Design a protein around this ligand. Sequence first.
Ligand SMILES: Nc1ccn([C@@H]2O[C@H](COP(=O)(O)OP(=O)(O)OP(=O)(O)O)[C@@H](O)[C@H]2O)c(=O)n1
Ligand SMILES: [Mg+2]
Length: 215
Amino acid sequence: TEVVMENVTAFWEEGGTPVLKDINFKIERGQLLAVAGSTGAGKTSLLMMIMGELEPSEGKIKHSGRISFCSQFSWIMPGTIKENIIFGVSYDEYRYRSVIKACQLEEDISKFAEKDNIVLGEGGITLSGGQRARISLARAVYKDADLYLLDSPFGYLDVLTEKEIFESCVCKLMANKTRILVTSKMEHLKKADKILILHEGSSYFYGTFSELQNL
Ligand SMILES: Nc1ccn([C@@H]2O[C@H](COP(=O)(O)OP(=O)(O)OP(=O)(O)O)[C@@H](O)[C@H]2O)c(=O)n1
Ligand SMILES: [Mg+2]
């Protein structure tokens, strides 16, 4: 067992309404959990509990090891595209290349005269929303970790590009890794080992896509 929540209830504000209520799930090592639900349902808050920024008022939580987190809000720091993706981690050519390929960034990078040394975040290039999202995803995936927390990482991408990168990056490149993906897309829920649908803090559904189909 790699990540467990058992009867978890939590509050952002003392005496407030709970942001998560009686949440239950289990992820085995190397599995994929999809976390879905409407705005404000508590999906990012769930990831924050795993990262220790939100403590449970009821229930138990299990997780161990290093975390790599991809925010739903893409970001860039001043530096090259290579520096933004490696972001202080040791460099390896093969690992870097495999990530940028899985994230479709090789096409973008190949069009620049400076290639991977193009400078971002310093007033030169203005990246599109989808470029910034794929760079942010690549940064999180390049980091070596035991658990990957990918919070709606496909912002600004069209549905086919999102499908392709879900398959090449989250399913293929990351096949051996424990992953929690916040996402609402049907194919992602179908390919996940488990699905957790949140609604106003509560567990709307927890199980497999197959079990939901059977209902
Ligand atoms: N520091 C915080 C973070 C969140 N919240 C509240 O906790 C609820 C859930 O927030 P969040 O987990 O961020 O919702 P998401 O499910 O991630 O919504 P979205 O899809 O829009 O990202 C919201 O009512 C939000 O106002 C809060 O009070 N204080
Ligand atoms: Mg969120």
